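Ticket reopened. Same input as before:
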Amino acid sequence: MQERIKACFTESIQTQIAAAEALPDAISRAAMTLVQSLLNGNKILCCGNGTSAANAQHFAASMINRFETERPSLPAIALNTDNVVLTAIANDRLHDEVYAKQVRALGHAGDVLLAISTRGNSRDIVKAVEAAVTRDMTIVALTGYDGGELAGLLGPQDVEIRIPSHRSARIQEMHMLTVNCLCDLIDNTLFPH
Amino acid sequence: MQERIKACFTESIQTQIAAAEALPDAISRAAMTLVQSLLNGNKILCCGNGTSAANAQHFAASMINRFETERPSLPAIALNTDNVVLTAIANDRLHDEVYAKQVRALGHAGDVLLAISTRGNSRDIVKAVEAAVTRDMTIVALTGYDGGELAGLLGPQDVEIRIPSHRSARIQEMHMLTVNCLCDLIDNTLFPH
Amino acid sequence: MQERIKACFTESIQTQIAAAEALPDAISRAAMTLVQSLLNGNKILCCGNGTSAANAQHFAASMINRFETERPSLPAIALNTDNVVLTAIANDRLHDEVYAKQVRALGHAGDVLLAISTRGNSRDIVKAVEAAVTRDMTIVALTGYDGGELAGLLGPQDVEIRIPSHRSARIQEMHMLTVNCLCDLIDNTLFPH
Amino acid sequence: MQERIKACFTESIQTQIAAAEALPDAISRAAMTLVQSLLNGNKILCCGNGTSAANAQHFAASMINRFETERPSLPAIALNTDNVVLTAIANDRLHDEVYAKQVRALGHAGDVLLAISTRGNSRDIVKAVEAAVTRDMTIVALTGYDGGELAGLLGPQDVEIRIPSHRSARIQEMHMLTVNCLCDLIDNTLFPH
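Engineering reply: fixed in the latest deploy. New output:
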């Protein structure tokens, strides 16, 4: 078990070191996008499945409540939290529209869709991006592996932060760190402390 | 048990009959308020605690997904669904602002806050209403008993639908029916045919 | 709008009157089943989609927290609340196993599955019942319309409470009342006040 | 922003390196505790607030659905997911027992309570641990800083995994990694091949 645990931490450390070198520019661009949207009075809609759903909620809470400093609640909403809405939509033929329906209903031009997916192929995530585009929203996608379908649906004004890894557990861990570095940048820019 | 069950249904029926006579006007006014907000491109924020939280989600899902008629998703969000955001806020001295923080962040002038409480005294609901007013939002309050503190915060443009009952179970049931008649009216007014 | 609202309340009142005459025996049996399971130290797993998910949570909260009197927390769990688990399972080919997986993992002989469905045809609900049977659990199904597939999967020791209605909104309202009369019976039998 | 992002990743990496040296033994002990409980037919109750709530759900979903290997659903439940139950409890004077009430109702001797808190002081977490001990449950606590009040409640059979850090963001990231290494061990021990 000891060896296994060490190998676990080592793979993580190696992934983070690889990421620290390759992701700074994308993370900075993503932060600029989020900050500008917020400054313009827009909101951030977030979505993800499974662990990615949890990472989306972590971003939402960091904005709505706080990350590390006392400042006003910032407008961010996770679209993977209302179990009534979710199980009701999935209780249909077009079950992959769970996120798309919410984006179409709530999204406004200037808003940002924070999409989180380890593999980037989930149909509900893809449809959410399609819906965001129909609402003139910008996309920030946290991905892994090869980016999947999601990476191929982003325009020049959108930002992909692809973790350099092909192991879901490591990618999800890196997504949490990514969200945290993003939150640190948002608050340092808008509410330094 | 037979008699008890019959007394249970009897109380419900008597309450519904009393409500049918006294609530149509208020329900109609609330429907007009909700319809007007939606037509103006605004959204409906909803909140409640416990069973009232469930009632809030039912309204949100009926808007976001659908009620009965086939039409586009309407913008409604329940503020009592993101467990990460909620437990994060209630993790400190600020438990009473679980809803207020979300209203501060998301509420825009013209939006509506659908507040649901059987007694109308819960501090977090009172504060959500207070915050909504600060954001130039109209309030539609579903209450019971004497309306509580919530009732005292409403202005000429807000609408209170106070179930004539002093038993939370009956009030909660009447709130679901109320929400359902409101959904029927919203859909009949916006998408008739 | 006034007339529409009145017709809404009238349909509800008529449904409740029809139910008060036809459901007492089934509700009593369901209550006996739930009480006996609890007395034997077992638990109640609950599941439903959409509004039914909300009704399931209402039962869970009434047991875990309280209904109307102060007594110990009773073991009831809604299987439609963990959004991470839900969106992760649905993020697969066997998406209809969202509830079944949880029942197989958590269910023990003697436990009860409280299944709520307006039409009784949802595949995830059907699979949850199949799983409960594999765990020697008893079933209490709150249904509507003709009972759908669900009604045809119940044995002699299981209990179906079929609302005499073919209108989802009315059925869901009646399910809440049914849960409340059930909770009143559970507490009157175990903790009278 | 570039430098800030790099300092962000650097702190994470340094923390992971420190943790790799000091936590293997504790993680191994925790894994053995979790595996033993599961083998005995027991379940794992999980709880946390905010981001720790998200981490708790990740562990629960990895057990209930799956982590990486194809095997049966394992019994784990996060106590911070039913928003109706949570808001119902926190609707009164009893907000600090949101988790304790669930543990009282559901906990059996032999079960394990996976408690997650960066500081280990939150009253609702302390009370959940207190209640778990009352139900003869073993405790696996994921903490940070100095372990807080939580650390002081642990006995010889419980396991504390205290991340060597004084920054909640880093601790939360390390908790996800910790949970992932634990899941890997559980699956390697129970379903190797």
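The first strand of chain A starts at residue 44 and ends at 48. The domain at 1-193 of chain A is CATH 3.40.50.10490 (Rossmann fold). Please confirm and we'll close it.
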